[PDB]
Amino acid sequence: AKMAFTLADRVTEEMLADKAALVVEVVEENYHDAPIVGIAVVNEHGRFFLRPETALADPQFVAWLGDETKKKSMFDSKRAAVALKWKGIELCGVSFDLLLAAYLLDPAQGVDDVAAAAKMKQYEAVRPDEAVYGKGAKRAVPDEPVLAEHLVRKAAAIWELERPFLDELRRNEQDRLLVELEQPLSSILAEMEFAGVKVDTKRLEQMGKELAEQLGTVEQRIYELAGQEFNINSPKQLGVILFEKLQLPVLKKTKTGYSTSADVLEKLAPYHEIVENILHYRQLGKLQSTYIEGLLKVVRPDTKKVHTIFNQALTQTGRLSSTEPNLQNIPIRLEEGRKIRQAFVPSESDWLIFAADYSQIELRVLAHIAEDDNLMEAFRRDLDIHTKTAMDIFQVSEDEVTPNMRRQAKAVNYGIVYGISDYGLAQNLNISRKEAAEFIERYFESFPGVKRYMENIVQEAKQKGYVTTLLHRRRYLPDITSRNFNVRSFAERMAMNTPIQGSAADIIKKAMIDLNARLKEERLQAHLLLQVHDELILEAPKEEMERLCRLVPEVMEQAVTLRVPLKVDYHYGSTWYDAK
DNA sequence: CCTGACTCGC
DNA sequence: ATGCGAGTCAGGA
């Protein structure tokens, strides 16, 4: 059953065909400055395994890797491209990435290795990486014989599966989504990750000491108010102290019993002082663990930079996810945590951080897709959408809109996008299930276009079996036909939300691509550092700020043309915190 | 090691 | 049962 291949000692001419399936293996999950343990090439002439030390030292191979005219088919080309960047080697000409192709065909499959992608086409002559390398404490690179056969089988699979994957992508009208959006974006993300973001570690350690001090005070205050010490981080221990020793009221429970969620403690706060302290302790506790100690652990000692990894094939909606560290969830809501951003600084002297973000892109996308006259007119007048919704569902003038009315219209606007229920609008606004239902009724009366879209998209999900975004990304919703109300309802909410969140993702991804091209033709030194769903963060010399103030917003606003305008706000400063 | 609770972001 | 994510810690394996 073994697969025939040449275990080459030297690089030859036939290994450099202008078309080939290429495997540049990096076994370490975090591929930054990680080892390349082997190389496999499959082309018209045969199958080959090359030892990295040999291949990467050969000027002929290296040139082939960087020759844009020599086309390569790979799996997760970003991983190889970045690992190669760390060795000062450029990877060009990747015309097909099986991981991205698999992801577009069905995000739900969770394809993370060649074997899983191959299985989609009944191809099983390749083993899953986990079966070869193992996982966790047991993970390790196998002997050359086992390793070489595994890499060649993966390259062989890629070589065989390219045509079948492209054909289905074409049938789905997703060929351009792969070739003109996701693949080019892959190279941009690779540059972003490689460049990294500089961290002011001394600033972070300084914040750590101040937090450690505060945590100490609130912690002692808590043990005092409870007249006993205990593990505040233990949901089990906290429960006995609150609901037993202190006799606090039990209003909500979890899957295992006593509920000490923030939603519960907020309502218990009036009963005992210890509750507000527990909450605060938890806030500071998150800052310390994840954003102080957690960040410090991944900052490179030598460059003082953090190199995140953007997973481009994980989310079910087309969004990116960020890991080790997650730079898409750095505090900003509360001031204490927002200060964390003062630690993210430009990588060069006299450079500044520039941040641009779309304003209400999801509601604007909803207005476009549903073609609701009232909603489109609101954005055409650049009105405060929450005040406008309040005026409509409460039928009052702009002057009569009280702060509480806007707060509730706000929760309704965002509930609508999430496919909220009269029950969940009730749990969020803490009101009557029938009153929440009437808010929704009112909303759909003022925005019948949105009502029609919600109804039609669900029927479409049931008729076709999936829903799609502006750029043809799709999500299958098999549970939409379930006879179980909860399972079915969840699928209906996904049907309503995916085209919105997904189209917003498509737009910013296209903006990133257009922006990179504009920065290059203008020969600006500014470059992308991060993407946070609806915002782009860049760093550039202070001298380029005036030009970026006009360029970035324009590129983002013109990424796609909708029935309503796209609005972008931007700010810049000496740190990410100041880019406000 | 793996699932759940919790808090962080958009 | 309002959409989509990641990291840390407690729990028990």
Ligand SMILES: OC[C@H]1O[C@@](CO)(O[C@H]2O[C@H](CO)[C@@H](O)[C@H](O)[C@H]2O)[C@@H](O)[C@@H]1O
């Ligand atoms: O390289 C990113 C790419 O790899 C996958 C597996 O094919 O995820 C691996 O790497 C991530 C970044 O280190 C980890 O979070 C993940 O656990 C690991 O399996 C893909 O999901 C991803 O697109």
